[PDB]
Design a protein around this nucleic acid. Structure first.
Ligand SMILES: [Mg+2]
Lengths: 190, 158, 258, 79, 59, 245, 42, 51, 107, 51
RNA sequence: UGGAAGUCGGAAUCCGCUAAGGACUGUGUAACAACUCACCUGCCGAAUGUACUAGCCCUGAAAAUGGAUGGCGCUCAAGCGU
């Protein structure tokens, strides 16, 4: 069955600018500006109402109709990122060897860099480079906590996932060796 | 001057009920020997039966009481022969108890019952007796409960 | 796992004997108003039936207790009926005759002491004298190569007959429990045995569709009784010794005579 | 599996005349054997097959049932 | 009796009721009844263990 | 649709009720209507409502129905044609949201006095306004979270540590004890569960319930009662204020 | 602000609606009438 | 699995064997004198194996 | 270490901070993983997987049928034969197999 | 102090019962929990029994 | 049962209050506690759920020189049905 018409709606807040041209969505807000290329998905964009963006698919199958929900959630995440932002709090815990975390900002590339030392007494220095637009700070309110903030949810969550996966324990019982850096909180900056 | 209430399970006529009680009443200043003596004195009516004992503790002395439970009342009303707990195990409470005794047990347990009337109280006691495994009036407690619903047996009101 | 005591006139349960962990497979009532039970929890228990209380508990067997037998079952089954074919006039005389028959059958060294033999699935029997020995068995009867199904004292109390699943019936001394002789000739497991009134003969009914009458003094197969088309489940010898009744899977009663 | 980077030996869809003839002969033998087994078959079969009836999503099933009642009543009146 | 002791013990107590997460075995099987018998049994067991040791050393 | 969520089958004793529960509620209400002089409508909005058992036990001579709102409305009768008694359709306009019916033979002033003197302290639900700021102190986390003094308190169970971490407390396990930061209460600030005037969400109310901190109360607000003799409904204080449908 | 908790922790996710691509073809009252007619037919 | 987790006890060496009723401080004494991690709790039969 | 030392470690220190959520996510991914295994395994491994899944489905259907039907010997034997393992127990003088395949002398 | 849940008579009886296992050995009775109750605070007939 | 409070086991599995709640579905404790599921109520809003059947697709077992719908290649076909 091909469905003749299907549509979705995305509300836009008052202080948010949205510009779509050739399925290239640019969303600007108080916190910055984001872009996303959605040219791989067949969708007709329109302005159905003042402050509401309409998404239409004509003569589409169930798969094509279902893709519009993903497009809606992606654009809503961009809007939330430029309005409130995204923040991931991570905790690093240890048993014997204290994990040393150093955060620097590379001046030439403009990206943050996280260096991890003394992970279960290892002599190697782990280096993980954040996605651009993601800021990392060592928290002062809580013990052994990093805070990753940004406008792109995908970039923030992927940077958190890279830091989590760089400190992997190998050839040890994970019921006994509990050392690592884990995502402890997800939310908005505002 | 603070009053503490401690509920435990004890066997009547035994001093060893304080064995699991002494580690927590020791710091409270209570003497386990006299606490067990008071427990045995309170539970001398309930020889061989697992009963619930309430301890009220204030100024480092304990007052003992026996909280009545439906299972203990039914097993006491069964009037089984005296037995040795250590040598005779895996017993079954298969004797018969009268409906008047069931109604008296329900009247005793009215202070715990949330039911509206003695019919519901007697039905709760009959269900407890059915779980125990005894008979009522030579018949099944479930059958007498069904008869009380169907109206053949009249339960007095209050 | 219970034994209930019923009053026959009213149909009311007076006592319930509980404490067994398995099915109570056999019950006897002795002349001292003691109830003996054997159960599948490898236990043989003695109860006072007036109070309904447990007096003795024996846990010597290693598997299911199949059968129990008393030294005075032959006179306890018949009470005051005996060879005279006449009954006493009054109930007191009848009770006195029954009591004196029980005492004559149950006297051990001048005092009344009922002896109990228990046949189990651990290939063994045990002999108990609760009056004189208590919880210590008189003897352990060994020699069967398979489970023992039925066991019975002789009417004179000198012999014990046991039927086993090893195709054999064995004879034992009823005093010290020593093995005497083996009655060989059955080809399927022997299910039941029964004594004659004069303690000369034992009839055994087996799974091999046959009854066999054995002379115990010569230790020989006196008579062979075929005719059942299927397995034999129940065998009885009459108290006056006139008839032997058998029944089983062939759905027909068979009475045998001399 | 690493099929894309290191494919294995291909499975040929090109037939051989010997295999084609053998498959045709076995198909003919199988249909003859099925005819023989259906002839010799002792399985019970009904004289009248179980008819499935009228579908529920057909919008005029009620009018069809009305017509069936009316026709049966008319046939009973005529007979 | 020896040809059936193992099957008899397994029939009396299955493996799952003896050891494991669902075991119900609480009382062990002992070759001694009293403390004096246990002391004599331990002395005889130590003597037999030692004697087996010198016999194996000599062999 | 081959791609679908596999429904779990429940191997549990209790089944779904269905239409027979609705018919039983209909029959119970329609058979308790003629036996009682007054029918109160009460509301308990955004409350835990487990103290209605105590209310039922106290008012043993009365009958309390706490079923579905539309089911009770159809049991009473929404229109004057289908109403069971004279004027119950005038009582049905109060049945919006979480409501209950109270069939009684007592005096209306007695019922109002009982429900005005009924006082109970209850755990807050989501959406309520926090009356005060709750802060778990740094160091060993105790059972009450600092409401009682720590000398009178007991350490919290070590099985609650993953639940506290999931609810957002940055707690850790030190030698078998749940601690907020360090065992000596260093290098970590206290955890503010809620602030005064802040609308509580379900995470904060779950944290307060696990720390046994009650920030609300259980109030039963009477909207109006119907009398069988008069045949008319009397409007009360909460009845004049609450929306009707 | 949202009061409920989301199971996977993505609190920014919107309150989704059910995926019903055939929504709006038939009305509720017509479906009630069809329910009555189908029940009588059965 | 139980044999793998069993402690190693040499029967022919210098040994201090602590015994008595439950809840009398045996595990507390062993924790005080040795490095063994045996639990100390106020309920009876906290220690259910040889340490 | 001695006795239940891993259980003691879990009591004293807990587990990894992501263990519960990762176990939940893996249990949630089991459906996609089972479909991928059904559509992508090859050969004898695929045949054994399909057979063992067929066995699981049969056992699950039996369990569901028993849970639906929760709310609803043969030959006479004596007492001493009860609770034992007993067999079920179900002119032209023709044998059960009157004709078999003939064997030639070279075979 | 009998805070273990068992009487001093029971402890002495257990010691006397397991005394035959102590043959050819080295026995020390350690009175624990001296911060709670001293040996001098006992009944002198208890003290005579311990002695 | 040393301990076993729905949740190591064996067997029973009833009643009240009910809107509904198992003499308990799992996590958990030494035992409790605590959490959770079944079931019920409030919010929301219109179509769903299960089991089978028929099409096409994937798997449903393969060795060994490099190769075959005849080859190129073909994806609203240059495949399949009419
Ligand atoms: Mg201890």
């Amino acid at each position: 069955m091909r469905y003749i018409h299907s549509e979705e709606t995305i509300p836009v807040p008052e202080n948010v600018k949205v510009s779509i041209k050739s399925r290239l969505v640019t969303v600007e807000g108080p916190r910055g500006k984001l872009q996303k290329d959605l040219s791989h998905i067949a969708v007709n964009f329109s302005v159905v109402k003042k402050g509401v963006i309409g998404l239409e698919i004509h003569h589409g199958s169930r798969k094509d109709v279902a893709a519009l929900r993903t497009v809606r959630t992606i654009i809503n995440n961009m809007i939330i990122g430029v309005t409130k932002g995204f923040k991931y709090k991570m905790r690093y815990v240890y048993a014997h060897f204290p994990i040393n975390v150093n955060v620097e900002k590379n001046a030439e590339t403009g990206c943050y860099e996280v260096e991890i030392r003394n992970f279960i007494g290892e002599k190697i220095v782990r280096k993980v480079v954040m996605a651009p637009g993601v800021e990392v700070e060592i928290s002062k309110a809580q013990k052994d906590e990093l805070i990753l903030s940004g406008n792109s949810l995908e970039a923030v969550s992927q940077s958190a996932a890279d830091i989590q996966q760089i400190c992997k324990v190998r050839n040890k019982d994970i019921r006994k060796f509990l050392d690592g850096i884990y995502v402890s909180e997800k939310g908005n900056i505002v | 001057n603070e009053i503490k209430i401690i509920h435990l399970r004890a066997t009547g006529g035994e001093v060893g009920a304080s064995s699991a009680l002494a580690p927590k009443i020791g710091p409270l200043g209570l003497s386990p020997k006299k606490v067990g003596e008071d427990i045995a004195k309170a539970t001398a009516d309930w020889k061989g039966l697992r009963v619930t004992v309430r301890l009220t503790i204030q100024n480092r002395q304990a007052q003992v009481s026996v909280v009545p439970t439906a299972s203990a009342l039914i097993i006491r009303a069964l009037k089984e022969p005296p037995r040795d707990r250590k040598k005779e195990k895996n017993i079954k409470h298969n004797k018969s108890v009268s409906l008047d005794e069931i109604i008296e047990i329900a009247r005793t347990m009215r202070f715990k019952s949330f039911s509206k009337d003695l019919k519901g109280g007697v039905k709760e006691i009959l269900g407890t007796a059915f779980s125990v495994g005894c008979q009522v009036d030579g018949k099944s407690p479930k059958a007498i409960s069904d008869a009380i619903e169907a109206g053949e047996i009249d339960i007095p009101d209050e | 796992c219970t034994v209930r005591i019923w009053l026959v006139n009213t149909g009311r349960t007076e006592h319930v004997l509980s404490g067994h962990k398995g099915s109570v497979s056999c019950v006897k009532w002795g002349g001292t108003d003691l109830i003996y039970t054997g159960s599948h929890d490898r236990s043989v228990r003695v109860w006072d039936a007036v109070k309904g209380t447990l007096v003795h508990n024996f846990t010597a067997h290693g598997h299911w207790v199949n059968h129990i037998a008393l030294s005075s079952d032959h006179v306890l089954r018949t009470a005051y009926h005996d060879h005279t074919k006449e009954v006493p006039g009054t109930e007191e005389e009848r009770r006195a005759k029954a009591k004196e028959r029980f005492e004559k059958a149950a006297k051990i060294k001048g005092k009344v002491a009922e002896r109990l033999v228990s046949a189990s699935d651990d290939f063994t029997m045990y002999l108990w004298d609760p009056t004189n020995n208590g919880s210590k068995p008189v003897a352990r009867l060994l020699g069967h190569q398979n489970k023992v199904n039925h066991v019975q004292f002789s009417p004179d109390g000198t012999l014990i007959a046991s039927a086993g699943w090893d195709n054999s019936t064995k004879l034992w001394n009823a005093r010290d429990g020593k093995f005497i002789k083996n009655l060989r000739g059955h080809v399927a497991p022997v299910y039941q045995c029964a004594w004659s009134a004069d303690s000369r003969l034992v009839v055994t009914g087996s799974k091999d569709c046959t009854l066999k009458v054995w002379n115990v003094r010569t230790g020989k197969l006196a008579m062979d009784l075929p005719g059942h088309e299927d397995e034999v489940y129940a065998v009885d010898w009459a108290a006056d010794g006139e008839l032997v009744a058998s029944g089983g899977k062939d759905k027909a009663v068979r009475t045998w005579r001399n | 599996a690493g099929t894309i980077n290191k494919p294995k030996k291909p499975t040929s869809k090109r037939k051989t005349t010997r295999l084609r003839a053998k498959i045709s002969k076995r198909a003919a033998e199988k249909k003859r054997k099925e005819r023989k087994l259906a002839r010799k078959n002792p399985e019970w079969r009904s004289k009248l097959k179980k008819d499935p009836g009228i579908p529920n999503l057909f919008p005029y099933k009620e009018r069809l049932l009305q017509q069936i009642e009316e026709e049966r009543i008319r046939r009973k009146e005529e007979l | 009796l020896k040809k059936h002791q193992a099957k008899m013990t397994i029939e009396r107590e299955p493996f799952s009721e003896t050891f494991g997460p669902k075991a119900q075995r609480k009382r062990p099987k002992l070759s001694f009844n009293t403390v004096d018998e246990l002391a004599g049994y331990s002395e005889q067991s130590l003597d037999s263990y030692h004697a087996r040791l010198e016999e194996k050393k000599l062999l | 649709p081959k791609s679908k969520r596999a429904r779990v089958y429940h191997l549990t004793q209790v089944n779904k009720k269905g239409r027979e529960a609705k018919e039983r509620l209909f029959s119970n209400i329609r058979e308790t209507i003629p036996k009682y002089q007054h029918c109160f409508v009460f509301s308990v909005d955004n409350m835990r409502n487990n103290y209605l058992k105590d209310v039922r036990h106290e008012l043993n001579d009365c009958r309390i129905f706490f079923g579905k709102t539309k089911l009770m409305a159809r049991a009473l009768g929404t229109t004057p044609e289908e109403e069971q008694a004279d004027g119950l359709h005038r009582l049905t306009r109060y049945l919006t949201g979480t409501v209950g019916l109270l069939f009684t033979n007592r005096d209306p002033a007695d019922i109002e006095s009982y429900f005005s003197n009924l006082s109970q302290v209850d755990f807050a639900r989501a959406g309520t306004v926090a009356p005060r700021t709750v802060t778990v102190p740094p160091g060993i986390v105790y059972s009450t979270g600092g409401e009682v003094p720590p000398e009178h308190d007991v350490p919290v169970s070590h099985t609650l540590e993953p639940e506290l971490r999931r609810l957002g407390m940055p707690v850790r396990m030190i030698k078998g004890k749940v601690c907020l930061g360090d065992e000596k209460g260093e290098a970590s600030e206290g955890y503010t569960i809620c602030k005064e005037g802040e609308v509580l969400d379900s995470r904060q109310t779950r944290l307060l319930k696990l720390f046994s901190i009650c920030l609300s109360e259980f109030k039963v607000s009477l909207l109006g009662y119907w009398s069988s003799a008069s045949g008319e409904v009397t409007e009360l204080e909460a009845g004049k204020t609450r929306p009707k449908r | 602000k949202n009061l409920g908790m989301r199971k996977n922790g993505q609190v920014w996710l919107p309150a989704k609606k059910a995926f019903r691509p055939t929504k709006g073809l038939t009305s509720w009252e017509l479906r009630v009438k069809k329910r009555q007619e189908q029940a009588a037919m059965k | 699995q139980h044999l793998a987790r069993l402690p190693d006890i040499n029967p022919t060496t210098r040994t201090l064997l602590v015994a008595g009723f439950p809840n009398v401080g045996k595990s507390s004494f062993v924790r005080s004198v040795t490095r063994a991690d045996t639990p100390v709790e106020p309920y009876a039969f906290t220690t259910k194996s040889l340490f | 270490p001695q006795n239940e030392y891993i259980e003691r470690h879990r009591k004293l220190h807990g587990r990894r901070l992501d263990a519960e959520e990762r176990a939940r996510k893996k249990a949630a991914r089991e459906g996609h993983k089972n479909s991928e295994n059904a559509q992508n395994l090859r050969g004898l491994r695929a045949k054994l997987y399909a057979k063992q899944r067929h066995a699981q489905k049969i056992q699950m259907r039996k369990a569901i049928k028993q849970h639906e039907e929760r709310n609803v010997p043969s030959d006479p034997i004596p007492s001493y034969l009860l609770d034992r393992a007993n067999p079920t127990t179900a002119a032209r003088f023709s044998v059960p197999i009157p004709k078999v395949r003939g064997i030639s002398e070279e075979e | 102090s009998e805070q273990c849940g068992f009487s001093l008579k029971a402890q002495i009886n257990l010691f006397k019962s397991i005394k035959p296992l102590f043959a050819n050995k080295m026995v020390f009775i350690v009175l624990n929990k001296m911060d709670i109750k001293k040996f001098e605070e006992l009944d002198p007939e208890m003290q005579q029994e311990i002695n």
